[PDB]
Amino acid sequence: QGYDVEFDPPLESKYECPICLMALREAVQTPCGHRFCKACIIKSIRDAGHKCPVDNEILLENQLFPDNFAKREILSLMVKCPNEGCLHKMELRHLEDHQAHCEF
């Protein structure tokens, strides 16, 4: 459930969620230093067990903490419109005003 849009330049792996393979949405980090979309890691914890999927370290829900720094950076990355026709690119946080703010 991460950000499914193409970044420019390509999304650095550091900001790629290892679960959904999309840009971290509401990024959270673990005590072991790994990052995930909040919803993805919660799901992984519930369906795959209480462990960090990257290194298998024990992981509890109460140990997940917000990574507002990564969140801030991701939201400032340049993205492109999800459909041929438009050529404009904008910071991810400004895509909304360019999602349904067009014709069809």
Partner: protein, 148 residues
């Protein structure tokens, strides 16, 4: 189809694992037709080995299912084509990917793991008759993995 699967598929086709051909089925995108070249210097050299890989509905929370179709003389592959690979059984993680499995199977062909509690009459033959077992894997390669 889950976005992650689409992305993995696109990336596997764009940048394929050397020596490995892997494509989704035209009728089912969760079904992959796989082909692995026998590792250079290994007793399987010169051979082409076919496998089928299936992405269960729980993927990536559940490991992909893989069946070795081509007959091969290897300790970690049974007659039913089942592959004994840790990341396909106990060590799977949603962080692992199809590429990981493919690369891991390719490595298994180069470094057989006869440390199995049975693996049929192939595991012990590989340890207590390695020279013969290897020559047998070689013969099976020419007999079953050379097309024709």
């Amino acid at each position: 189809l889950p976005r992650r699967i689409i992305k993995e598929t696109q990336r596997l086709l764009a940048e394929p694992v050397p020596g490995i051909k892997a494509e989704p089925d035209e009728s089912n995108a969760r079904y992959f037709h796989v082909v692995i070249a026998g590792p250079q210097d290994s007793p399987f050299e010169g051979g082409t080995f076919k496998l089928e890989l299936f992405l269960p509905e729980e993927y990536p929370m559940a490991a992909p299912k893989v069946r070795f179709m081509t007959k091969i003389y290897h300790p970690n592959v049974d007659k039913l084509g089942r592959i004994c690979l840790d990341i396909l059984k106990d060590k799977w993680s949603p962080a692992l990917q199809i590429r990981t499995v493919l690369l891991s199977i390719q490595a298994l062909l180069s470094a057989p793991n006869p440390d199995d509690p049975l693996a049929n009459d192939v595991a012990e033959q590989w340890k207590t008759n390695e020279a013969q077992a290897i020559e047998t894997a070689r013969a099976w390669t020419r007999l079953y993995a050379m097309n024709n």
